[PDB]
Amino acid sequence: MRKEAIYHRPADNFAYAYDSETLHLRLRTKKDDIDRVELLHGDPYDWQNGAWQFQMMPMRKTGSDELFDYWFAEVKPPYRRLRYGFVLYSGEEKLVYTEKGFYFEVPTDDTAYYFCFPFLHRVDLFEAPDWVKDTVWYQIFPERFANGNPSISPEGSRPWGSEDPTPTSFFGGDLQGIIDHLDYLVDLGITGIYLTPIFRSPSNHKYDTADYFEVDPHFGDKETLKTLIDRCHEKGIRVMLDAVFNHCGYEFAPFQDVWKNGESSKYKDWFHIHEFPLQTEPRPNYDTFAFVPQMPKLNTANPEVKRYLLDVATYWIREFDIDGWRLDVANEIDHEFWREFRQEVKALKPDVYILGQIWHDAMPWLRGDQFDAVMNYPFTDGVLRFFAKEEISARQFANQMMHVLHSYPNNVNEAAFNLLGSHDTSRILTVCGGDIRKVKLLFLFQLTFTGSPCIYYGDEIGMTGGNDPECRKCMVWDPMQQNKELHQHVKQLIALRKQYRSLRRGEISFLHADDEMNYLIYKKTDGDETVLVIINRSDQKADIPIPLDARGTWLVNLLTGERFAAEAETLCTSLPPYGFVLYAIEHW
Amino acid sequence: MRKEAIYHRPADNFAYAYDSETLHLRLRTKKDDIDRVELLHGDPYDWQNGAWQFQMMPMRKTGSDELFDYWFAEVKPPYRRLRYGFVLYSGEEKLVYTEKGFYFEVPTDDTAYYFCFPFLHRVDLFEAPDWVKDTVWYQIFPERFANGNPSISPEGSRPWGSEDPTPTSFFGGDLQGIIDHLDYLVDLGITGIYLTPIFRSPSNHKYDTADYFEVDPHFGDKETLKTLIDRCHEKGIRVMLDAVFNHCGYEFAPFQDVWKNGESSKYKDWFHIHEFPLQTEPRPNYDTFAFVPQMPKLNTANPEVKRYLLDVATYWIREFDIDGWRLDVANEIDHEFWREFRQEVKALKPDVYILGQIWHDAMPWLRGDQFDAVMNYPFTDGVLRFFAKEEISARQFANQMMHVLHSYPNNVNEAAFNLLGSHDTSRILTVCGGDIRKVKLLFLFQLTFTGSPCIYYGDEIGMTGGNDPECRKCMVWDPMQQNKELHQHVKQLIALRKQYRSLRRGEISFLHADDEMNYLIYKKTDGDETVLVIINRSDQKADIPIPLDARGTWLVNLLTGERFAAEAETLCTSLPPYGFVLYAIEHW
Ligand SMILES: OC[C@H]1O[C@H](O[C@H]2[C@H](O)[C@@H](O)[C@@H](OC[C@H]3O[C@H](O)[C@H](O)[C@@H](O)[C@@H]3O)O[C@@H]2CO)[C@H](O)[C@@H](O)[C@@H]1O
Ligand SMILES: OC[C@H]1O[C@H](O[C@H]2[C@H](O)[C@@H](O)[C@@H](OC[C@H]3O[C@H](O)[C@H](O)[C@@H](O)[C@@H]3O)O[C@@H]2CO)[C@H](O)[C@@H](O)[C@@H]1O
């Protein structure tokens, strides 16, 4: 029992309101250092004789990362007010952790010793559109999906798929192409399309916005967008658009004016300009995305720039009915803006998925007053290092997955954007060194993990390539090229996910196999149903023992449909190289 | 090194923008475990020759508590963007602490391992009024200060000072009384007056409001309030009113109504009612302050309530130019509401001090989007447990002191409302058990601590009594009965506080004393100023040595005036029981 490692603080991941009456509490201890923990809790004003009235509830260890045990307790305070503490036991030896420090005995003559959650407010409750939890995304890079209309393909467009993607090449893909391949997506199981920037911009990626109210001429038109979205909506698909608000393009109307007028520009305060007139040599004299001259940072602090951006935001929702906004480099925009952004957006269309792009611990942006989710990169890094690269062991993977999960609140975790790759990364199959068997595992872990999974175009058919622009080759539409074992694999898994809530929203726990270096075993539970997953992460066959109690326990193979039961001597599966299996557990 | 004890989370007290180009980073470690710490930092996009240009800035240990060491670092990102990690040294052993975990050597092929502080936006910077940081408040209980206008006292009042008050007694205290005695305060040094509730309320404490827009008649009228405030302004004193928004009183018009027309009431949504019709037996079927039927909880999520309390907030400010609101039981009101509260208030009178009564860690209400400051109860707890009750040791008081301070951002601690007692706690003299010496040590530690200190009426003249109602006696105006020793003592200190910047805005640290059981040596510094204080929390004469490097060292007794130099053998200090001394330190 080492106090040095004990920790809890009343906010974010450690203390939060799950729903209106239930609030969850976490505690963190040294790995294996504690046996059991009990939450001390009671209404702040419940008193009898100079004694505070409390109840004791045991906490359950929900996971462990490299060097910490995480404990969980969910209490529905009688009057929505609560004061709590923790009683730690190490082989019957006890300790008392509170806001005022530790003690051998439980203080009861005042409540200032204890941590406090003053009151459960419905309006503060974190809440992300429920649908996203059941959705399964497919990110599209319009320029390279499908050229469904050549008349508007920019001059120079290379023959589709012909050569390798360069920073300045074009192939003529357009929104019409997407409308032209929607069934394909509807067949895969996709239920949401996330598109990358489409508003008019010089480049092929469109991350350097030219006009936030115009559909890039080469992609199509308002008329064309609407039909895309409506066609998607009738097919049961939601549409997410990308919003590059951190900065604009060199060609942004206002920026041009500041450049050709400088100090006297009607828009000098629209940017982060230090010296006049603007320069670029050696480096820019005005803040930019990184050090890119064509991407001058917008000043979201100016009431105008702010009004404008808020207009753009509501415009598209109000005029096209998109179901969400993906906002890149969002972590670089001030919280004050994001606070409004939500207010306005949510005022218009309540269940709009506001996904901010953040490449690090995003807790400050996931409290309920801003984004609904972020890009779960820790998930990405993890899954790849284990399944694809094979650089970390299974205990390590379980460690990092638990580490990222206990880092946020449960409801925030339920709406996490889980992707294995993107337009800014290498192609998952290329990371797998070309091993399809591995990619199969990624999708497997992806599609059984709680949250909102996203699939990068072509990763389901086996596309390959390095990192940007290499990961942006044209979609592959010829069957003789698109690895079908994967298609059916993905398609198959997407089906299971829709079928099993535990997969979509349940809790995850890792069972210790007799080799935490190549075999990974875990299960998903939403309290009602339970699915079990066993993976053989190695290039050899293996006989794996399923660690389950057999009393009234039945397992169902979700891939073959087969069924059977665990006896007074349960069994052990055995998969081939990179093999796997899913079992629905029944407790009769 | 103890990895499990090392900790850092990019937010709240650990990472925060101090100003518009300077941000603070803080790290936690097991006390004495780490030799040195260095902050590894650099701009997220400054790469050259394929290597991330990052620098190594050494960190400073600003204190420790029971179990930890706290390290500090001040950094100005060249482009207001920053990626960082921490490097720890213990002998030859090296650890690199990052968002992605511990490493035994600086990873450099990426910036993702590192903790991140995206951008420095002025709109996200924390800012409490500055005037507050040089103020010294005096808390008054209008009912017990002075019966300036005996024509409006309530029927039944007792001759001023007749006997010990009761929860229902009245001594006809009024606002005129305050005005009449302003000179007494102007003489003491008071530069800020905080008043408890003054709006219409059947009680003698007025915490159960009847009408937020009416000044209790027995206290005075709108007109009388102006003059008190206008007169206060010319004597250079700020005025702060106490607003009770968490709950109303049984006599509050809207509630009375619900109490007549149940579920049909046009106001049933201004409260937290569980079943209709309302009931108080066996217990109230509606949420109240604690379990007090007379105090119905307002539902600040309701749009009408919300708009109402906001108008009340800006009404008095707007028409009476008050200098700040002390918001009662603020931790039980939703965050969203406080966010409007600040928006509204600040747009009206930016320098309005927004103080919230939160009896526990309040990090969540102090991010700059809600409260400017809260009652620093931890302060009071430590201060009394050591100087008054003599329960904890000096070392303990020290840790407790650092523990709190390090749980908040330097700029937040800069505006803390540091009080020793209220109309809710007993009397400081009564807690010292009569010893005027101990109490005298309290004013000392209070008036040498950073923040905004406050003095309970009478404390400065030796008034006594137990916990509510006993602590709310009638202000002793008889010179034959008030304790003039303390008065001057207090008048003496507030003066030094005024002239010694380092005393109100400086950093604090505890010079390890020999008898780490009864002596306390600490100094205050703001970068230039440097005051040192030595206290003999003992009932015996003590010879206490001064731990200071004496190469160009000049001490200045801020009490006698005497000046002297420090020699190789650090000068020792002789002090009587419970004696004390403050020196000004000059390095030449
Ligand atoms: O300017 C050159 C590149 O611009 C565009 O890159 C986009 C990127 O595609 C988009 O996802 C986003 O990325 C945000 C992150 O960028 C880096 O990875 C930082 O480390 C991280 O802190 C950011 O959050 O924004 C950029 C800029 O618009 C083009 O897509 C890319 O092809 C160009 O090479
Ligand atoms: O009739 C009930 C009481 O009402 C008033 O009490 C005030 C109190 O003076 C004011 O500071 C504030 O206190 C809130 C705190 O109350 C307790 O101390 C809890 O331990 C703490 O957690 C709360 O934050 O609000 C109450 C209610 O108005 C009268 O002053 C008091 O005499 C009455 O008993």
Q: What does A473-533 look like in DSSP terms, one character per residue?
A: PPPP--TTTS-HHHHHHHHHHHHHHHH-HHHHH-EEEEE--S-TTTEEEEEEE-SS-EEEE
Distance CA A6, CA A60 (A): 15
Say how many Å lie between the first and final Cα of chain A, rounded.
39
Burial class (CB in 10 A: 0-12, 13-18, 19+), A168: exposed
Three-state DSSP state, B277: coil
Residues sharing a CB contact under 8 Å with residue B495, sequence separation 6 or more, in sequence order: B189
Task: Name the helix (H) or strand (E) containing A40.
Answer: strand A36-42
Dihedral class, residue A201 (left if φ above 0, else alpha if ψ from -120 to 50, else beta): beta
Q: Do residue A45 and residue A34 come from a single domain?
A: yes
- Chain A partners of B5 at a C-beta cutoff of 8 Å? 4-5
Contact predicate A289/A329, CB 8 Å: yes
Give how far Cα B387 sits from Cα of B328, B391, B511, Å: 28, 9, 17
Distance CA B398, CA B404 (A): 10
Burial class (CB in 10 A: 0-12, 13-18, 19+), A431: buried
Distance CA B259, CA B268 (A): 9
Distance CA A417, CA B361 (A): 32
Which pair of structure tokens corresponds to residue B16?
Answer: 């925060």
Q: Compute how many other C-beta atoms are within 10 angstroms of the C-beta atom of residue A474.
A: 24
HSE-CB at B580 with a 13 A cutoff on CA atoms is 23
A359 close to ligand 1 (CB < 6 Angstrom): yes
Contact predicate B369/B128, CB 8 Å: no
Distance from CA of B369 to the nearest CA of A (A): 8
Q: Do residue A53 and residue A131 come from a single domain?
A: no
Q: What is the DSSP letter of B274?
A: -
Q: Which domain holds residue B510?
A: 506-588
Angle among Cα A188, A189, A192 to the nearest 5 degrees reads 115
- CATH code at position A42: 2.60.40.10
Q: Compute how many other C-beta atoms are within 10 angstroms of the C-beta atom of residue A583.
A: 23
Distance from CA of B530 to the nearest CA of A (A): 30
Give how far Cα B128 sits from Cα of A526, B413, B415, Å: 45, 10, 7
A328 close to ligand 1 (CB < 6 Angstrom): yes
Distance CA B163, CA A435 (A): 90
Q: Compute how many other C-beta atoms are within 10 angstroms of the C-beta atom of residue B225.
A: 21
Q: Do residue A501 and residue A512 come from a single domain?
A: no
- The residue out of A460, A483, A505 marking a domain boundary is A505
Residue B581: alpha-carbon gap to chain centroid: 25
Closest Cα to atom 26 of ligand 2:
B207
Which pair of structure tokens corresponds to residue A585?
Answer: 């557990």
**How many A from CA of A190 to the centre of ligand 1?**
26
Contact predicate A118/B331, CB 8 Å: yes
Q: What is the largest CA-CA distance in chain B?
A: 86
Look at residues B295, B298, B363 and name the one whose alpha carbon lies nearest to residue A9.
Answer: B363
Q: What share of chain A is helix, strand, coil (3-state, %, to 5)?
A: 25, 25, 50
- Chain A partners of B116 at a C-beta cutoff of 8 Å? 331, 359-361
Give how far Cα B289 sits from Cα of B5, B286, B360, Å: 39, 10, 17
- The residue out of A98, A125, A152 marking a domain boundary is A125
Look at residues A139, A141, A146 and name the one whose alpha carbon lies nearest to residue A453.
Answer: A139
DSSP secondary structure string for all residues of A414-465: TT-EEES--TTS--HHHHTTT-HHHHHHHHHHHTTSSSEEEEETTTTTT---
Closest ligand to the CA of B362: 2
**How many A from CA of B43 to the centre of ligand 1?**
15
- What radius of gyration, in Å, describes the C-alpha atoms of chain B? 26
A377 close to ligand 1 (CB < 6 Angstrom): no
Residue A339 phi, psi dihedral angles, 5° rounding = -65, -45
Look at residues B548, B544, B545 and name the one whose alpha carbon lies nearest to residue B578.
Answer: B544
Ligand 2 pocket by C-beta < 6 Å: which residues? Answer: A 44; B 205, 207, 244, 289, 292, 328-329, 357, 359, 423-424, 468
User: A118–B331: do the CB atoms touch at under 8 Å?
Assistant: yes
Residues sharing a CB contact under 8 Å with residue B348, sequence separation 6 or more, in sequence order: B314, B317, B318
- The residue out of B487, B505, B523 marking a domain boundary is B505
Distance CA B121, CA A468 (A): 31
Give per-residue burial for A264-300: e unless 16+ CB within 10 Å, then b: ebebbebbbbeeeebebeeebbbbbbebbebbbbbbb
Distance CA A124, CA B339 (A): 11
Residue A493 phi, psi dihedral angles, 5° rounding = -65, -40
Look at residues B129, B199, B141, B193 and name the one whose alpha carbon lies nearest to residue B170.
Answer: B141
Q: What is the DSSP letter of B436?
A: H
Q: Which amino acid is at B204?
A: N
Three-state DSSP state, B170: coil
User: A360–B291: do the CB atoms touch at under 8 Å?
Assistant: no
Q: List the single residue in A with minimal CA-CA distance to B286.
A: A79
Q: Compute how many other C-beta atoms are within 10 angstroms of the C-beta atom of residue B354.
A: 25
- Tell me whether strands A519-525 and A82-89 are parallel, antiparallel or unpaired: unpaired
Distance CA A523, CA B204 (A): 62
Beta bridge partners of B82: B117
Q: Select from A194, A244, A329, A333 the residue to mutate for testing ligand 1; criterion: most ligand atoms less than 8 Å from CB.
A: A329
Angle among Cα B434, B439, B442 to the nearest 5 degrees reads 160
- Chain B partners of A331 at a C-beta cutoff of 8 Å? 116, 118-119
Residue A457 phi, psi dihedral angles, 5° rounding = -50, 125
Q: Do residue A265 and residue A356 come from a single domain?
A: no
Distance CA B473, CA B495 (A): 28
Contact predicate A59/A38, CB 8 Å: yes
Which pair of structure tokens corresponds to residue A400?
Answer: 């990092």
Give how far Cα A376 sits from Cα of A49, A450, B531, B542, Å: 50, 12, 50, 61
- Chain B partners of A124 at a C-beta cutoff of 8 Å? 334-336
Dihedral class, residue A199 (left if φ above 0, else alpha if ψ from -120 to 50, else beta): beta
Q: Do residue B60 and residue B112 come from a single domain?
A: yes
User: B377–A112: do the CB atoms touch at under 8 Å?
Assistant: yes
- CATH code at position A290: 3.90.400.10
Considering Cα of A112, then A116, then A120, then A125, what sign does the dihedral take? positive
Angle among Cα B304, B308, B309 to the nearest 5 degrees reads 125
- Chain A partners of B45 at a C-beta cutoff of 8 Å? 290-291
Look at residues A312, A317, A370, A363 and name the one whose alpha carbon lies nearest to residue A341.
Answer: A370
Contact predicate B191/B134, CB 8 Å: yes
State the structure-solving technique: X-ray
Backbone break loci in chain B, preceding residues, C–N > 2.5 A? none
Closest-lying ligand 1 atom to the alpha carbon of residue A205 = 30
Contact predicate B521/B547, CB 8 Å: yes
Q: Do residue A93 and residue A164 come from a single domain?
A: no
Alpha helices in B154-263 (DSSP H): 175-188, 222-234, 253-261
Q: What is the DSSP letter of A551?
A: T
Contact predicate B533/B443, CB 8 Å: no
Q: What is the DSSP letter of B158?
A: P
Contact predicate B519/B536, CB 8 Å: yes
Say how many Å lie between the first and final Cα of chain B, rounded.
39
Look at residues B70, B365, B158 and name the one whose alpha carbon lies nearest to residue A119.
Answer: B365
Distance from CA of A195 to the nearest CA of B (A): 25
A289 close to ligand 1 (CB < 6 Angstrom): yes
Which pair of structure tokens corresponds to residue B360?
Answer: 């526990």
Closest ligand to the CA of A202: 1
- Inter-chain contacts counted by CB atoms under 8 A, chains A and B: 118
Residues sharing a CB contact under 8 Å with residue B202, sequence separation 6 or more, in sequence order: B208, B210, B249, B251
Beta bridge partners of B115: B84
Look at residues A305, A374, A368 and name the one whose alpha carbon lies nearest to residue A337.
Answer: A305
Q: Do residue A112 and residue A206 come from a single domain?
A: no
Q: What is the 3-state secondary structure (H, E, C) of B68-100?
A: EEEEEEEECCCCCCEEEEEEEEECCEEEEEECC
Resolution, angstroms, 1 dp: 3.2
Best mutation site among A288, A334, A340 for testing chain B: the one with the most B CBs within 10 Å? A334
Domain count, chain A: 4
Q: Which amino acid is at B531?
A: V
Give per-residue burial for A313-344: e unless 16+ CB within 10 Å, then b: bbebbeebebbbbbbbbbbbbbbbbbbbbbee
- Chain B partners of A377 at a C-beta cutoff of 8 Å? 112
Three-state DSSP state, B233: helix
Give how far Cα A381 sits from Cα of A138, A390, A426, A480, B229, Å: 19, 12, 12, 31, 61
Q: What is the DSSP letter of A385?
A: I
Alpha helices in A172-298 (DSSP H): 175-188, 222-234, 253-259
Closest ligand to the CA of B328: 2
Which pair of structure tokens corresponds to residue B225?
Answer: 């309030």
Residue A524 phi, psi dihedral angles, 5° rounding = -115, 135
Contact predicate B80/B117, CB 8 Å: no
Q: What is the largest CA-CA distance in chain A?
A: 85
Residues sharing a CB contact under 8 Å with residue A64, sequence separation 6 or more, in sequence order: A31, A70, A399, A402
Q: Do residue B442 and residue B571 come from a single domain?
A: no
Residue showing tokens 């006890």: A94
Q: At what angle do helices A222-234 and A303-320 cross, to 10 degrees?
A: 50
Closest ligand to the CA of A110: 2
Give how far Cα A247 sits from Cα of A255, A295, A333, Å: 10, 6, 9
Q: Do residue B358 and residue B403 come from a single domain?
A: yes
Distance CA A474, CA A172 (A): 10
Closest Cα to atom 16 of ligand 2:
B329
Residue spans of beta strands (DSSP E) within B402-550: 417-419, 452-456, 507-510, 519-525, 530-536, 542-545
Residues sharing a CB contact under 8 Å with residue A475, sequence separation 6 or more, in sequence order: A144, A145, A146, A173, A457, A458, A463
Distance CA A147, CA A145 (A): 7
Residue showing tokens 């030796």: B462
Look at residues A407, A357, A374 and name the one whose alpha carbon lies nearest to residue A11.
Answer: A407
Q: Do residue A28 and residue A75 come from a single domain?
A: yes
Closest ligand to the CA of A139: 1
Three-state DSSP state, A86: strand
Q: Do residue A264 and residue A360 come from a single domain?
A: no
Look at residues A315, A578, A551, A570 and name the one whose alpha carbon lies nearest to residue A445.
Answer: A578
- Tell me whether strands A417-419 and A452-456 are parallel, antiparallel or unpaired: parallel
Distance CA B462, CA B428 (A): 9
Beta bridge partners of A534: A521, A581
Distance CA B319, CA A219 (A): 58
Contact predicate B150/B172, CB 8 Å: yes
Distance CA A219, CA A121 (A): 45
Which pair of structure tokens corresponds to residue B453?
Answer: 């200190």
Which pair of structure tokens corresponds to residue A439?
Answer: 């990619």
Among A115, A290, A335, beta carbon nearest to B124? A335
A218 close to ligand 1 (CB < 6 Angstrom): no
Q: What is the 3-state secondary structure (H, E, C) of B331-395?
A: HHCCHHHHHHHHHHHHHHCCCCEEEECCCCCCHHHCCCCCCCEEECHHHHHHHHHHHHCCCCCHH
Among A5, A79, A334, beta carbon nearest to B4? A5
Look at residues A456, A521, A531, A508 and name the one whose alpha carbon lies nearest to residue A486.
Answer: A456
**How many A from CA of B328 to the centre of ligand 2?**
8
**How many A from CA of B494 to the centre of ligand 2?**
29
User: A369–B4: do the CB atoms touch at under 8 Å?
Assistant: no
Distance CA B232, CA B438 (A): 32
- Tell me whether strands A238-242 and A324-327 are parallel, antiparallel or unpaired: parallel
HSE-CB at B125 with a 13 A cutoff on CA atoms is 18
Give how far Cα B564 sits from Cα of A58, A82, B511, B560, Å: 62, 56, 20, 12
User: A10–B115: do the CB atoms touch at under 8 Å?
Assistant: no
Does residue A378 have a cis peptide bond before it, meaning omega lies within 30 degrees of 0? no
Distance CA A381, CA A139 (A): 18
- CATH code at position A552: 2.60.40.1180
Three-state DSSP state, A314: helix
Q: At what angle do helices B484-499 and B436-446 cross, to 10 degrees?
A: 20
Q: Compute how many other C-beta atoms are within 10 angstroms of the C-beta atom of residue A83.
A: 26
Give how far Cα B348 sits from Cα of A553, B323, B341, B471, Å: 66, 11, 11, 36
**How many A from CA of B470 to the centre of ligand 2?**
15
Q: Do residue B355 and residue B327 come from a single domain?
A: yes
Look at residues A422, A425, A437 and name the one whose alpha carbon lies nearest to residue A387.
Answer: A437
Residues sharing a CB contact under 8 Å with residue B489, sequence separation 6 or more, in sequence order: B440, B443
User: A339–B369: do the CB atoms touch at under 8 Å?
Assistant: yes
Look at residues A87, A10, A31 and name the one whose alpha carbon lies nearest to residue A402.
Answer: A31
Residue showing tokens 């305050």: B178
Contact predicate A451/A503, CB 8 Å: no
- Side by side, the strands of the sheet bearing B68-75 are B15-17, B23-30, B68-75, B60-64
Q: What is the DSSP letter of A387?
A: I
Alpha helices in B207-284 (DSSP H): 222-234, 253-261
